[PDB]
Ligand binder design. Structure first.
Ligand SMILES: *[C@@H]1O[C@H](CO)[C@@H](O[C@@H]2O[C@H](CO)[C@@H](O)[C@H](O)[C@H]2NC(C)=O)[C@H](O)[C@H]1NC(C)=O
Ligand code: 1PC
Ligand code: NAG
Lengths: 93, 182, 147, 79, 150, 238, 43, 50
């Protein structure tokens, strides 16, 4: 959450007054312009996302279906003995 | 609220749905040479309307499948209609509401906004004696008015974009005369 | 000058210089090519973000300064081994300091040097916001695909 | 709602007019007041051709109307 | 090259029977480099002291390989001992103030480069020559989330 | 009868004359109401919380690669002479060649051209564009995605080579980072007004583009009905 | 008024959008009665 | 409407906005939060006065 406040970037560091200074900086910066950095980005960091925000319109599933299909399944089997009595009820009058 | 018919559907839809009614009525008549024109056209243009009018029903097995899906077509559309209209009644624009001194909109005064205060008053003392707020005091002097009564009448029409004054005077003004707001 | 970093504004009509919270920068303009003018100079005042950070750094480490603008074009680029803009003005040992809106790349690191950056930026795409929404399969998305 | 009801009266009068070209005004108004609300009560519809298209357009009014009512009503339970 | 352990940048895994570690492939199936990394084992080097070769693979070391192509040099990385980035403090109440942790080895004759998530700051920049940054970053907060209704 | 009754009494039918049939159809109709109604809202709820997606993926997409093969191509240009085009003229030479057809001038003229439909895309520095969003009256302009950048660089202070002021200023700016007053400076200058989590505005009038699915379902139903007709007839006369 | 959320009822302004067409349909069919009856006496 | 009302509302309770939430400046004993020892983050906090 929130927003970043203390901002800076990681860096490669050497000892003071080394002959490798003036050449590494040119190379590392050159990588950004060519696009070599972005190729490595996709493969290692930004590849998997379970990030369906927060609103998340919920695709209602069969968990809801139990509360209604149980009722309808009752009627087909709770009427069978209601059938039995009424046809007999016709025979009784 | 716009117009009832036009707001939630484009004029293109009305033609396409309407013409299809005649279209979907056609092969119904053709499906009767498998194994009543006045009937068939009423059957379809009625069911979309959810009316309570009808005389007969199709008998050939070929049309039996077509009618079933045709009914489900109607329910989705009317459901689609009642859904978004609902979208209209819940969405509104913001923007104009400003948030006091902290708003960036009142620290770099462009030539579109004008402040306002009563001259030679308490408010002027608070600004000029501040330091980091001086950037708006320079824009401040060029438009200040003479007295309270004139200023309110000047903002009812588009002549002043904002006003600064006490709440105990402004709050009553907004509550009784309810064209404005704090 | 640029919109968010170096805003230019005319001086106060009464005193001669504009209000506080700024530094006076004087710019150069010359008359037509047929007849030219002898050091014709006009002063204005510059204020914004880079000006404030420069003032802070000058207060941090004691040294004075005086700001004067440039006229020969824009940021600058390499043409036939020559340079315009701020890079051109600093390559000839006549400026000694360039501030404002300078990007960083490969070529420029070979002529001038650079300090630690303070604002992340780069190349971005800006488009008009389409009026409408997206719903290719709206009518089927809700409820369930198995019931 | 009174503007709705008076139009019920006028269209009932129009239906009476159409019949000139087993039907009663009570049955006609019952039909109309049924179709306006989800056509719940089964009713014997008239045999008039023009009256039938008239009640059809009335049903169009009924369906638009009702849908808006529902939608709008939500507007009031969440703000 | 001295590199601290980290989650997204330097993975560490034990080797296989033959001495190296088996080569695997990603969704693209392109080989991923497995340069030998000789770091200490266990959680802390306090009680034990064991040095065992492993292979470490990830993001930053690839930059080392790509950089080493232009500047022709060889390398042999090994992880730091203490396992902490490090700062400065006072010891024995004397006038001498020294660095501990990953920072120290660069200071006194045990390395010549650092490739790791080492943040730039005023104190560390006093005497070290940082190059250009290659990944703009920041620091934020994370907390647990709460399950919604059914 | 029942398959039509599940959906707003739509189909006129003839009713069985029993009693247990009556109770069964009644309970099914009840199942009815809830199911239909539940479907109606849930759909309303879903369409309330939509998510707008811009009509582009990125600079690397084919939509910016072969403009000639599509609908009237995107009219997009950049201000010349900047560092932006030098990046373009080194990786997308053909795209740079196509660029010169429009060749905008300045910034404000480009913004106005975008507002009037003459232009439909723009490439320039990240920092300026992000600030330009919060100043416009209303909010009809937004960067792509979440403000993502494609070439991570930064501004700086350019000085003449080989002077100790390099070390002095470089060590000094980190002091300014140290105390966090640049947060105050940002809150004073580069902060923006609108664009609070991209709440979106409204869908409207639902033109033909979306109902293509239901129209395709109708056409498929007609096709399968005709196939069933021909199959039944050919099997029948045998 | 207050509560800047502003949930507002619809009123007569929407009546014209519905009543006019359906009332117009009423007068649209008056002569349709005459037309159709003429057809019955035509053949 | 009732089922429509329930499916769209969440009543967001609270989240740590940043370094301005009074849930951190005036710490209680219901929150325990820490960093990594001898690290970059630790330097930033100690030098600050407020
Ligand atoms: C971009 O740079 C080019 C340099 O080629 C500028 O073109 C010159 O503009 C000046 C200004 O009027 C003219 O005097 C030159 O004759 C132009 N030279 C050429 C070769 O065209 C161009 O003006 C610059 N763009 C902007 C917006 O200033
Ligand atoms: C009773 C009341 C309302 C309906 C709706 N139904 C939608 C399509 C058009 C027929 C009515 C669905 C529920 C929301 C109101 C509209 C069905 C049953
Ligand atoms: C560029 O330089 C070459 C030689 O250095 C010269 O002949 C040519 O005229 C120059 N052209 C421009 C446009 O500066």
């Amino acid at each position: 959450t929130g927003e970043l406040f203390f901002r800076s970037g990681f860096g490669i560091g050497m000892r003071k007054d080394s002959p490798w200074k003036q050449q590494v900086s040119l190379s590392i910066l050159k990588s950004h312009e060519n696009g070599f950095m972005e190729d490595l980005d996709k493969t290692w960091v930004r590849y998997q996302e379970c990030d369906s925000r927060s609103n998340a319109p919920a695709t209602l599933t069969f968990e809801n279906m139990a509360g209604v299909f149980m009722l309808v399944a009752g009627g087909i089997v709770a009427g069978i003995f209601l059938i039995f009595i009424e046809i007999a009820y016709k025979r009784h009058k | 609220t716009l117009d009832s018919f036009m707001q939630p559907f484009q004029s293109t839809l009305w033609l396409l749905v309407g013409l299809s009614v005649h279209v979907v009525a056609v092969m119904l008549y053709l499906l009767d040479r498998f194994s009543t024109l006045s009937s068939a056209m009423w059957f379809s243009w009625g069911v979309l309307l959810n009316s309570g009018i009808g005389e007969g029903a199709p008998r050939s097995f070929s049309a039996r499948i077509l009618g079933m899906v045709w009914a489900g077509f109607a329910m989705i559309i009317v459901a689609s209609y009642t859904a978004n209209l609902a979208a209209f009644l819940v969405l509104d624009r913001p923007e104009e509401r400003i948030t006091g001194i902290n708003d960036p909109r009142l620290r770099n005064p462009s030539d579109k906004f004008i402040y306002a205060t009563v001259k030679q008053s308490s408010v002027d003392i608070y600004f000029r004696r501040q330091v980091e707020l001086s950037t708006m005091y320079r824009h401040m002097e060029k438009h200040n008015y003479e007295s309270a009564a004139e200023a309110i009448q000047a903002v009812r029409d588009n002549k002043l974009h904002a006003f600064i004054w006490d709440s105990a005077v402004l709050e009553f003004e907004a509550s009784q005369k309810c064209d404005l707001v704090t | 000058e640029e919109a968010p970093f170096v805003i230019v504004e005319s001086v106060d009509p009464l005193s001669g210089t504009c209000m506080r919270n700024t530094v006076p920068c004087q710019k150069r303009i010359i008359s037509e090519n047929k007849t030219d003018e002898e050091p014709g100079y006009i002063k204005k005042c510059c204020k914004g973000f880079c000006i404030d950070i420069l003032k802070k750094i000058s207060k941090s480490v004691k040294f004075t300064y005086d700001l004067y603008l440039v006229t020969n074009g824009k940021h600058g680029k390499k043409i036939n081994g020559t340079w315009n803009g701020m890079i051109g003005e600093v390559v000839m040992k006549r400026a000694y300091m360039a501030v404002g809106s300078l990007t960083i790349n490969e070529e420029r690191s070979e002529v001038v040097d650079f300090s630690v950056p303070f604002i992340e930026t780069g190349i971005s795409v800006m488009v008009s916001r389409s009026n409408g929404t997206v719903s290719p399969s709206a009518f089927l998305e809700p409820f369930s695909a198995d019931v | 709602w009174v503007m709705m009801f008076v139009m019920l009266l006028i269209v009932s009068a129009v239906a009476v007019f159409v019949f000139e070209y087993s039907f009663t005004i009570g049955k006609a108004i019952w039909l109309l007041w049924g179709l306006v609300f989800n056509n719940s009560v089964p009713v014997q519809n008239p045999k008039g051709t023009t009256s039938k298209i008239m009640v059809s357009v009335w049903a169009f009014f009924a369906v638009i109307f009702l849908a808006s009512y529902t939608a709008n009503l939500a507007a009031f339970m969440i703000q | 090259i001295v590199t601290i352990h980290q989650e997204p940048f330097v993975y560490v895994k034990p080797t296989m029977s033959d001495g190296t570690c088996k080569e695997e492939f990603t969704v693209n199936g392109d080989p991923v480099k497995k340069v030998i990394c000789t770091g200490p084992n266990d959680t802390s080097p306090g009680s034990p002291r064991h040095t065992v070769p492993q292979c470490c693979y990830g993001f930053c070391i690839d930059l080392l390989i790509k950089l080493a192509r232009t500047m022709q040099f060889t390398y042999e990385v090994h992880l730091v001992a203490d396992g902490k980035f490090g700062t400065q403090e006072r010891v024995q109440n004397s006038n001498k103030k020294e660095w501990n942790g990953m920072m120290g080895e660069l200071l006194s004759g045990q390395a010549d480069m650092i490739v790791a998530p080492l943040t730039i700051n005023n104190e560390r920049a006093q005497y070290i020559e940082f190059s250009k940054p290659f990944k703009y970053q920041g620091l934020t907060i994370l907390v647990k989330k709460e399950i919604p209704r059914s | 009868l029942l398959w039509g009754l599940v959906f707003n009494n739509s189909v006129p039918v003839q009713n069985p004359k029993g009693t247990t049939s009556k109770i069964m159809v009644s309970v099914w109709a009840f199942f009815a109401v809830i199911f239909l109604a539940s479907y109606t809202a849930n759909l309303a709820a879903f369409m309330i919380q939509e998510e707008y997606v811009d009509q582009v993926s990125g600079l690397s997409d084919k939509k910016f690669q072969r403009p000639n093969d599509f609908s009237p191509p995107f009219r997009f240009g950049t201000v010349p002479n900047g560092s932006t085009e030098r990046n373009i003229r080194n990786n997308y030479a053909e795209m740079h060649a196509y660029m010169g057809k429009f060749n905008q001038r300045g910034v404000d003229d480009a913004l106005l051209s975008l507002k009037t439909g003459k232009l439909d895309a723009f490439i320039y520095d990240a920092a300026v564009l992000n600030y330009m969003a919060g100043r416009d009256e209303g909010c009809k302009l937004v960067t792509i995605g979440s403000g993502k950048v494609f070439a991570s660089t930064g501004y700086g202070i350019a000085i003449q080579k080989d002077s100790g002021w390099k070390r002095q200023v470089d060590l000094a700016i980190l002091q300014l980072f140290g105390d966090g007053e640049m947060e105050e400076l940002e809150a004073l200058w580069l902060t923006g007004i609108c664009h609070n989590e991209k709440n979106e505005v409204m869908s409207s009038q639902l033109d033909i583009d979306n109902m293509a699915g239901v129209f395709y379902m109708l056409g498929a139903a007609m096709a399968l009905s005709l196939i069933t007709f021909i199959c039944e007839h050919l099997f029948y006369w045998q």
